[PDB]
């Protein structure tokens, strides 16, 4: 009762405390008719994709790969990269990863034990015990949400005003 985020709204009844980044924020009750693991996986995937996208947009408006095709702004880079076939390679490998993801999310939903977003990818450690893993999961979630909103703002401002890196 009385979820932490919205103090005047009831607790979403599906987010008690046992999830990283769980401040009880679900006013429209998306968790009431969708699996929690599915939504967590979707959120983490969005976080990672948008973090990579924000970093790439900002960097590519500064540094360009050698070649005349890579001499466009990130706003206009989509139509150039799709014509050159640059985005085709990313599409192919992302589709391979996403088919393996289809298998992984199916197994997670039907038992297994794989945590949402846990691909066990960890060449370095950066997370030795449970406490470090929880803290870094919270950091990843917060940074990913911030980067999703940041990429949203960057794209909207750049489309509104065709400016360089300062999209004001």
């Amino acid at each position: 009762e009385k979820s932490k985020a919205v103090p005047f709204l009831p607790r979403p009844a599906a987010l008690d405390g046992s999830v990283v980044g769980d401040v009880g924020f679900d006013p429209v009750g998306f968790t009431s008719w969708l699996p929690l693991s599915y939504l967590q996986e979707a959120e983490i995937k969005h976080c990672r994709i948008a973090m990579l996208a924000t970093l790439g947009w900002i960097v590519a408006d500064f540094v360009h790969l050698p070649g005349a095709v890579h001499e466009v702004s990130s706003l206009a880079a989509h139509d150039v990269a799709v014509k050159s076939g640059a985005l085709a390679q990313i599409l192919i490998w992302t589709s391979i990863a996403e088919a393996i993801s289809v298998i992984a999310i199916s197994q997670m939903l039907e038992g297994s034990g794989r945590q949402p977003g846990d691909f066990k990818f960890d060449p370095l450690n950066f997370a030795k015990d449970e406490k470090s893993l929880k803290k870094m999961q919270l950091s990843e979630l917060k940074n990913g949400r911030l980067a999703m909103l940041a990429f949203s703002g960057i794209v909207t401002q750049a489309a509104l005003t065709g400016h360089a890196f300062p999209y004001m």
Partner: protein, 177 residues
Amino acid sequence: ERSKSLPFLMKPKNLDGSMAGDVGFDPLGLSEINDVGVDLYWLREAELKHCRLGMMAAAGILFVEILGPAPGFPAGKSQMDVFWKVYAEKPSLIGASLAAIAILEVISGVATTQGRQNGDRAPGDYNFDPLGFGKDPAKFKDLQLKEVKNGRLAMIAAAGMILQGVSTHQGALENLS
């Protein structure tokens, strides 16, 4: 048995004494509506939202007309017509404000319906007391009465300002003198 405000009318059944500003002024018996998701809880929440919105709007009109606009913002003293001058030059501000108000209003409606269902939240309550001006009781009732009276007065005032600006196309205090 008779309403305090209207002695020629019987006391409205649903308005005993609880809500701040209750004087029994329900001649049409609207407090007894229990259909289309509308009841005393919904009516009180709507009244409080109207009170707060009217207070904010009246304060904004008076502030802008007396102390002038903020730097970088248009002038004209007609608040119903300066809106189109702001939108003509800063449409993004208006759009962002509208989107924020839309999200907050969706949250407000969800909260109203939930609090009506599992009764734990008083109508118009959003737990918004950052400065702790209404922590203790015996002052909360007085603050509720002050808010309700000021909000009704500002509702009437803001409706008047809207109509005056739409019709006369002049400022509020311009109409005053």
